[PDB]
Amino acid sequence: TFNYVIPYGGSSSYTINNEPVKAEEVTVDFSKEPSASSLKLADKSDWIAYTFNNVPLMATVGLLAGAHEAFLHYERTPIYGKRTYNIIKKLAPIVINKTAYATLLGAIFCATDALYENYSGKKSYTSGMVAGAATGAVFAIGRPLPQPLVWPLVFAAAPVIADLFGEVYPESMKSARGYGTPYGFENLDDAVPTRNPIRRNPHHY
Amino acid sequence: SGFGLQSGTARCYDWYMDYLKCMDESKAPMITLRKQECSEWLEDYNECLHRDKLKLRKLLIEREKNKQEAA
Amino acid sequence: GWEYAGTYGALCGMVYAIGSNVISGRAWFRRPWVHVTSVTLSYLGSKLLDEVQDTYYLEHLKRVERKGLQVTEEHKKLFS
Amino acid sequence: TWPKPINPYDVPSSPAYHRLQEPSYPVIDKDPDFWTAVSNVRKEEWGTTAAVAAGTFVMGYYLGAKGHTGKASAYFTSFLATKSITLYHAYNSADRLMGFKENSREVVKNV
Amino acid sequence: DEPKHQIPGNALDNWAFLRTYAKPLPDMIHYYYYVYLFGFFFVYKVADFPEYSPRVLVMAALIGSLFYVRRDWVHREFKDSP
Amino acid sequence: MLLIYIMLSNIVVLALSVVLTSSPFMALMYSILLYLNVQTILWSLGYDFMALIYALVYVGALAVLFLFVVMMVRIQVSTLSTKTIQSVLSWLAIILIFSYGDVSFSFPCGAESLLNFGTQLYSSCSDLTLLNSLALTIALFGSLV
Amino acid sequence: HNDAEFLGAVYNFSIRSVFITGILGAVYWRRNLITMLLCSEIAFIACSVNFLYASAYLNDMAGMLFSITITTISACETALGLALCVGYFQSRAANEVEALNLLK
Amino acid sequence: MWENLWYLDILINVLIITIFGLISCSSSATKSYDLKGCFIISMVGGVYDIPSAILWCLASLSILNFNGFFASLFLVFTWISNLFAMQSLNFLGIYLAFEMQSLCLLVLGKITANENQRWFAYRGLLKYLVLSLIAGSIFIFHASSSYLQSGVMISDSLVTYVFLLFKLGVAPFHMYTLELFSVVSRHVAFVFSTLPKLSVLYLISNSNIGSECVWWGLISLWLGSISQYQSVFVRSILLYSSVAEIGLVLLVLQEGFSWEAFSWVSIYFLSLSGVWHANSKFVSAISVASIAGLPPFLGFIGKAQILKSLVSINLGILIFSSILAATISFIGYLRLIRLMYLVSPVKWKNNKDSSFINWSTWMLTVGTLPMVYSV
Ligand SMILES: CCCCCCCCCCCCCCCCCC(=O)OC[C@H](COP(=O)([O-])OCC(O)COP(=O)([O-])OC[C@@H](COC(=O)CCCCCCCCCCCCCCCCC)OC(=O)CCCCCCCCCCCCCCCCC)OC(=O)CCCCCCCCCCCCCCCCC
Ligand SMILES: CCCCCCCCCCCCCCCCCC(=O)OC[C@H](COP(=O)([O-])OCC(O)COP(=O)([O-])OC[C@@H](COC(=O)CCCCCCCCCCCCCCCCC)OC(=O)CCCCCCCCCCCCCCCCC)OC(=O)CCCCCCCCCCCCCCCCC
Numbered sequence A: 001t002f003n004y005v006i007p008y009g010g011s012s013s014y015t016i017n018n019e020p021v022k023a024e025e026v027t028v029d030f031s032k033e034p035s036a037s038s039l040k041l042a043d044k045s046d047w048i049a050y051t052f053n054n055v056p057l058m059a060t061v062g063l064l065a066g067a068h069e070a071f072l073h074y075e076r077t078p079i080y081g082k083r084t085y086n087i088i089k090k091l092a093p094i095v096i097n098k099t100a101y102a103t104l105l106g107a108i109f110c111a112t113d114a115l116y117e118n119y120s121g122k123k124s125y126t127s128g129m130v131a132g133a134a135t136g137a138v139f140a141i142g143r144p145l146p147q148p149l150v151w152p153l154v155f156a157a158a159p160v161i162a163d164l165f166g167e168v169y170p171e172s173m174k175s176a177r178g179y180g181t182p183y184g185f186e187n188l189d190d191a192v193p194t195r196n197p198i199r200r201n202p203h204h205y
Numbered sequence B: 001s002g003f004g005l006q007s008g009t010a011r012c013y014d015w016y017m018d019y020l021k022c023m024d025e026s027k028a029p030m031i032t033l034r035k036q037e038c039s040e041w042l043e044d045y046n047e048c049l050h051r052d053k054l055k056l057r058k059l060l061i062e063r064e065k066n067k068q069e070a071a
Numbered sequence C: 001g002w003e004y005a006g007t008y009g010a011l012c013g014m015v016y017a018i019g020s021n022v023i024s025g026r027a028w029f030r031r032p033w034v035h036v037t038s039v040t041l042s043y044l045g046s047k048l049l050d051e052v053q054d055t056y057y058l059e060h061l062k063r064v065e066r067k068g069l070q071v072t073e074e075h076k077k078l079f080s
Numbered sequence D: 001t002w003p004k005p006i007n008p009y010d011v012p013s014s015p016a017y018h019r020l021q022e023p024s025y026p027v028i029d030k031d032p033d034f035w036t037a038v039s040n041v042r043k044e045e046w047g048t049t050a051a052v053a054a055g056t057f058v059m060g061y062y063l064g065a066k067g068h069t070g071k072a073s074a075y076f077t078s079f080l081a082t083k084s085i086t087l088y089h090a091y092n093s094a095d096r097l098m099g100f101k102e103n104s105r106e107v108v109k110n111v
Numbered sequence E: 001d002e003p004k005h006q007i008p009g010n011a012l013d014n015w016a017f018l019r020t021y022a023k024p025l026p027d028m029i030h031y032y033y034y035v036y037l038f039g040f041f042f043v044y045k046v047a048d049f050p051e052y053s054p055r056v057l058v059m060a061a062l063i064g065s066l067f068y069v070r071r072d073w074v075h076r077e078f079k080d081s082p
Numbered sequence F: 001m002l003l004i005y006i007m008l009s010n011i012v013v014l015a016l017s018v019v020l021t022s023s024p025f026m027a028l029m030y031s032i033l034l035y036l037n038v039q040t041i042l043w044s045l046g047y048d049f050m051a052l053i054y055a056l057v058y059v060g061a062l063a064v065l066f067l068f069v070v071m072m073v074r075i076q077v078s079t080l081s082t083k084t085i086q087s088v089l090s091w092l093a094i095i096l097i098f099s100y101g102d103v104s105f106s107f108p109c110g111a112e113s114l115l116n117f118g119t120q121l122y123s124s125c126s127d128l129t130l131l132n133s134l135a136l137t138i139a140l141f142g143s144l145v
Numbered sequence G: 001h002n003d004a005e006f007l008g009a010v011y012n013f014s015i016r017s018v019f020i021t022g023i024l025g026a027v028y029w030r031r032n033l034i035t036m037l038l039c040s041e042i043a044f045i046a047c048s049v050n051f052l053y054a055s056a057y058l059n060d061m062a063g064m065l066f067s068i069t070i071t072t073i074s075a076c077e078t079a080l081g082l083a084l085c086v087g088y089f090q091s092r093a094a095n096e097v098e099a100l101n102l103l104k
Numbered sequence H: 001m002w003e004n005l006w007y008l009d010i011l012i013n014v015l016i017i018t019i020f021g022l023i024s025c026s027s028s029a030t031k032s033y034d035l036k037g038c039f040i041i042s043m044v045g046g047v048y049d050i051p052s053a054i055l056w057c058l059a060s061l062s063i064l065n066f067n068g069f070f071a072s073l074f075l076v077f078t079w080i081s082n083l084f085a086m087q088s089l090n091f092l093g094i095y096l097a098f099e100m101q102s103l104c105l106l107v108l109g110k111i112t113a114n115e116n117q118r119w120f121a122y123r124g125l126l127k128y129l130v131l132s133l134i135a136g137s138i139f140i141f142h143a144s145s146s147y148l149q150s151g152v153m154i155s156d157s158l159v160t161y162v163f164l165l166f167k168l169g170v171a172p173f174h175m176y177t178l179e180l181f182s183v184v185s186r187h188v189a190f191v192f193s194t195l196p197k198l199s200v201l202y203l204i205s206n207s208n209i210g211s212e213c214v215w216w217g218l219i220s221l222w223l224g225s226i227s228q229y230q231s232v233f234v235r236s237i238l239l240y241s242s243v244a245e246i247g248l249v250l251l252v253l254q255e256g257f258s259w260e261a262f263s264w265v266s267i268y269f270l271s272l273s274g275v276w277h278a279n280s281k282f283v284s285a286i287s288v289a290s291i292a293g294l295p296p297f298l299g300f301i302g303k304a305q306i307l308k309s310l311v312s313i314n315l316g317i318l319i320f321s322s323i324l325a326a327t328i329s330f331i332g333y334l335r336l337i338r339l340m341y342l343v344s345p346v347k348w349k350n351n352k353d354s355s356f357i358n359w360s361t362w363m364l365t366v367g368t369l370p371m372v373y374s375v
């Protein structure tokens, strides 16, 4: 409007609908659909199955962290001097404990997420928040004062961030095209494509 | 490459060229689609390269022969 | 394309001559020969850039028409 | 199978680089020699060659003088630039003879 | 004289704590070799990993960030003992 | 068949010996024996000239270069022997893990010919021969300075 | 039952072991720079042998050309690396002890 | 035989210039301007497209600041390797071109070190060499397995993608750049942190070498940004900035946005030229601002192309990460600006050799308005 007399923006009729018009005459899709593996892992029906399918990721991350710390300890120890102690006995707890703690935290998160979703019966943000909060509570069992408040918050926030930018964002902005005519405005006289642009072939790596 | 070791061409050059010709004939707008259409030619090239079907057939024949012999 | 490429280029050449003088600690008016050379070269380069951009715009219009974009006469007018 | 016999003296061979294209225009010469290509170079191209040679002589002298070897640099730069531009012009003329590129003037001049 | 921030701790105790970083330093090539090797093998393996939910991925990233130990931390606390 | 098997199995022992030995001079000697075993493996696949190439470039020339460097930089590396039983089994385990269950293909035999190899190198594949020559020139210029 | 299948499996095991021994051998058992470059050569030789094996399997010349390329590049890389090692050793300060043994 | 002549001309040109420089070697002309000009003219014979013309521009600008016949010859060798990398059709072309470029880097690094700088330069060159050998050996071993299994050498494979990831220096394969480029000369680090990238981007775009995985660019973006913020030394700040940006660029290039990466590499080259060849505080400030992405400079256009490409793919996680990582990087660039004009009096060497530096600063300031059409 760019005036001071009437409200800015506009209004669209709710009664009047515009019949959908295809973006192009022929649509070629270079985006592959989700794999059967993805759907299997995503299935939260059985909490135990869901947990056991998704823990490998947490275990791997714990193993990488433990390997990192163990290597740092091993690198410093001197080869030239003989050591009374056994290095593996010193280093094995590091890796084992890190992997176990990571797996336990990821198990708690996955279990609570599946159990809440089943009990509630709906896929919602709350399920992620309560799983994160429970994981952060387990993380901060014996930590000083600030940490009990901070970790349940950071952990609860992480599934919120994942849901907003991993699931809601793409579905929200699926229609936008970028070529031909703007999604909403097809009356405007813009070049109309016979086929959609294919910027890349479907990936295979 | 495609060249042979002693002369001529590789042992399975012709099968690959057959598959490439099939892909050239196809009108699919993406390479993935054309490979899907020409998959049978690729299966022939892979079959000539490794002889996997013949190896399986021989394994089954040998195994049955052993079963008959033991009986 | 751009109808102000020549003017822009001349002013930018001035920007080069003054900036080079200032960076080296000399005053803007020093080395007068540099000013003419910079102005002319920048003007020509700006013009050349505009033709290059136009040429690749037309190449793109040809390509999109070949692909199947049903560009109208007015659209074919947009790309000089 | 049986090894195919090979003739050592006549073993099939090919150049490394190949242009994958069917001749759009008439083929005045299927396999032009260097001299045939040079003889078909247009007058404008020779003018470009001479302008390049002069410009590179002047630039070579200018750059060489800072190192006290102006004449030597000028001659080397001239020769180098003339040679490269001449090879480019001969490649273009050979492509025209082969029918890959437009040869209207070429066919008319040498029937 | 101007008002200045109070520094917690005694001067000699803080300097002693700072001096625990002055230890034989390993070369970083040893760490890099292993990281390059395992990283190459990891990239090859990653193509075959199952597709994970975004939420699980983010949680794994959080856990990895929390469990990552800075190289300086191990360096200061490293003791050559059982 | 026994000889081919023995050479194939030996190449592993000759590779393990290089890393295990603590003397840099001795490691080169084991590497030279490994190179000869590789020449003999190549002979079983039907290559004669290629196996000659490996021995010429590596045994004939590269090993000499390694010896020259080792003599000039000679250090005292007979400090201590750290080949504890625990370390060796861990190494052999890592090796076994990496070298297990990969795709295997039937052993082939292929007669090679220099006439075809030379023809291809200097006709159809001339681009490679000249880039390799440029690489050698780059190495010559950089090493000599 | 098939000698070639057995021999192919043996070859695959051997070549893979030689590759891992070259790439990770000198780093695992901490050695001098000269041993690292020798094990790197061992690894490159293993890969070139794999290419020659493939060329024999497929009756193709591509592996023989990749393998000659490996021989050339590997020798150039070794010569340059050894030059760097000598230059590094000639500049060592008196305090430095195992200058060549970075992994110590 | 005529197609071969095009390639042959480059070799003949290089050899004749080499032997002329060798014959005419004298103290009177240590800076062989004439040979530099001959090399520049020679490299015009390899321009076939726009990417080749960008390769020529960057190589010529790099050649200007090298001193002596030897360094300029090795830059021409680098150019030849880069030209062949773009044209590589299979594993052999990729391996050969990249390893030749690695050899040229090893020589250029070695011949630009003083006797007092040999201890650290040769160590960093050796560490680069050994890491390069790991990368090349894993590449060739996997390539051999692929060639055996498939019978053909196809440049569309995971093996090449991982190798080109190492060459770009993203994800965990960026440490060689940090170790080598910290101990080498400023010009060598600048020319080998920008020019090589163009060839790899061209190979990826033309040979369809893209993966569905976004982890490596996300990692490079976050690691680079956090490491840039925590780095005390200024060389490390500049080195980690390239890691972060090339991670984001890798993510954009996988999705098919070739034009934006080719425009980015050119702007990044011009932006990095003035910071690396530091002589004037003002030139360095304008460079840091362009790398940062401030809107009045050409650096803004380069960053804008990448960010604009990101919003098209509609991946939320990448956009969020990009915003936060960019802020963290901005803090490091502010540190750089603070160090020059807000910490202590600054005195720098009077190295009055600003060949293309004034032109680059001008091109950064002035170029924003002409290139506004792209974004
Ligand atoms: C924009 C959007 C972006 C998109 C794209 C952007 C585009 C990208 C690319 C664009 C690039 C732009 C930025 C880069 C700018 C280039 C750098 C630059 O500016 O110059 C660097 C460079 C830096 O010089 P420097 O800072 O002093 O350092 C060099 C050292 O001296 C080192 O010394 P040296 O040993 O190396 O000496 C070599 C050199 C360097 O030597 C020198 O520079 C010394 C000074 C040269 C002599 C003085 C020049 C004489 C006339 C100049 C006119 C000035 C007018 C001002 C006052 C009016 C006086 C009446 O000598 C030369 O000058 C070679 C050229 C030959 C011409 C010499 C003069 C010939 C006689 C006059 C010709 C015609 C007379 C007509 C009228 C005459 C009077 C008006 O400047 C030059 O080299 C000058 C080149 C030419 C001199 C002027 C000639 C102009 C012709 C006369 C005017 C007539 C109108 C012009 C139109 C018709 C032409 C005939
Ligand atoms: C046997 C060999 C030993 C190695 C073991 C394995 C060998 C490698 C095999 C495979 C390697 C590939 C994958 C490994 C990770 C990739 C990184 C890499 O390889 O670079 C080379 C790297 C060395 O490179 P460098 O350039 O020499 O060192 C640069 C640093 O400055 C180094 O200097 P610095 O360490 O002294 O400084 C560390 C600095 C460096 O900074 C970083 O680490 C940046 C990384 C941040 C995130 C990375 C991207 C995350 C995306 C992951 C993608 C997958 C998920 C997909 C979606 C997730 C969306 C984000 O960070 C810190 O200051 C410590 C904090 C840790 C992260 C900071 C973020 C905290 C946020 C949490 C919020 C909670 C606080 C709330 C309360 C606060 C109160 C106010 O080598 C390694 O570190 C490998 C060690 C493997 C341990 C990683 C642990 C988990 C791995 C996956 C989790 C992903 C998060 C990454 C966390 C830490 C990674 C460094």
Ligand SMILES: CCCCCCCCCCCCCCCCCC(=O)OC[C@H](COP(=O)([O-])OCC(O)COP(=O)([O-])OC[C@@H](COC(=O)CCCCCCCCCCCCCCCCC)OC(=O)CCCCCCCCCCCCCCCCC)OC(=O)CCCCCCCCCCCCCCCCC
Residues within 6 Å of the ligand: C049, C051, C052, C053, C055, C056, D052, D056, D081, D084, D085, D088, H041, H042, H044, H045, H047, H048, H049, H050, H051, H053, H054, H056, H057, H258, H259, H260, H262, H263, H264, H266, H267, H363, H367, H370, H371
């Ligand atoms: C005078 C007429 C010029 C107008 C047009 C130019 C075309 C005709 C060329 C005529 C020559 C003028 C040179 C101007 C352009 C250079 C291009 C070129 O030359 O080749 C193109 C031309 C054909 O390729 P094409 O036109 O690009 O189209 C091919 C396909 O379309 C595939 O190619 P494509 O990549 O173009 O595909 C279309 C592309 C769309 O691509 C585009 O839209 C390109 C946009 C144009 C940007 C221009 C900037 C590029 C920087 C290079 C500067 C030129 C250096 C000159 C080098 C050669 C010197 C002659 O779509 C894409 O998505 C691909 C991405 C492309 C890259 C993204 C563009 C961003 C570039 C970076 C900009 C970032 C800003 C940084 C700073 C900006 C500050 C203002 O090749 C030739 O005609 C023959 C080449 C012969 C050159 C030398 C031979 C003569 C001498 C022989 C012997 C030499 C030795 C003796 C020496 C003699 C002197 C001493």
Ligand SMILES: CCCCCCCCCCCCCCCCCC(=O)O[C@@H](COC(=O)CCCCCCCCCCCCCCC)COP(=O)(O)OCC[N+](C)(C)C
Residues within 6 Å of the ligand: D054, D057, D058, D061, D062, D063, D065, D070
């Ligand atoms: C105006 C048309 C004709 C101009 C006459 C030139 C024709 C000669 C043929 C070409 C020779 C090279 C052209 C000269 C340009 C650069 C030469 C140069 O570098 O100038 C000086 C030094 O460098 C400079 O002073 C820079 C000058 C830059 C150019 C200024 C001249 C402007 C016009 C000349 C070229 C215009 C076109 C040339 C023909 C197309 C050279 O120093 P010395 O090697 O010691 O030679 C001097 C001889 N002696 C001392 C023994 C008496």
Ligand SMILES: CCCCCCCCCCCCCCCCCC(=O)O[C@@H](COC(=O)CCCCCCCCCCCCCCC)COP(=O)(O)OCC[N+](C)(C)C
Residues within 6 Å of the ligand: D016, D017, D034, F126, F127, F128, F130, F131, H001, H002, H004, H005, H007, H008, H010, H011, H012
């Ligand atoms: C950046 C590139 C890196 C890699 C480049 C690989 C691509 C270049 C590969 C070629 C290298 C040079 C090989 C010669 C190139 C072109 C071929 C040629 O011109 O030879 C002529 C031979 O033709 C001739 O004109 C003979 C005289 C040649 C005289 C010199 C021309 C070639 C000079 C090569 C430069 C090498 C000389 C020393 C190097 C300074 C063609 O061969 P034919 O047609 O089979 O033989 C003639 C028979 N007939 C015409 C009847 C069909």
Ligand SMILES: CCCCCCCCCCCCCCCCCC(=O)O[C@@H](COC(=O)CCCCCCCCCCCCCCC)COP(=O)(O)OCC[N+](C)(C)C
Residues within 6 Å of the ligand: C045, C046, C048, C049, D063, H033, H034, H036, H037, H038, H040, H041, H044, H057, H063, H064, H065, H352, H353, H354, H355, H356, H359
């Ligand atoms: C549409 C354009 C916009 C797109 C941008 C890309 C296209 C580029 C267009 C313009 C390019 C201009 C490049 C500017 C370079 C600046 C000139 C330069 O660098 O000169 C150097 C040259 O230095 C040299 O090394 C000279 C060696 C070679 C000289 C030039 C070679 C000429 C070869 C022929 C080039 C013609 C191109 C061939 C066909 C296209 C002199 O500086 P120094 O003396 O070293 O130090 C300066 C000291 N101070 C400023 C502080 C006073």
Ligand SMILES: CCCCCCCCCCCCCCCCCCCC(=O)O[C@H](COC(=O)CCCCCCCCCCCCCC)COP(=O)(O)OCCN
Residues within 6 Å of the ligand: A120, A122, A124, A125, A126, A127, A153, A154, A156, A157, A160, A164
């Ligand atoms: C950058 C965003 C990060 C959040 C920052 C918040 C402050 C961090 C403190 C940590 C706390 C954990 C994160 C909680 C934020 C979510 C907001 C709570 C609101 C809420 O509980 O409703 C849920 C939906 O909200 C939602 O989950 C969607 C709301 C989106 C979050 C807010 C977006 C803007 C915040 C940015 C403010 C400033 C940015 C600087 C950080 C339930 O929904 P339901 O579907 O489950 O219904 C129930 C049927 N069972």
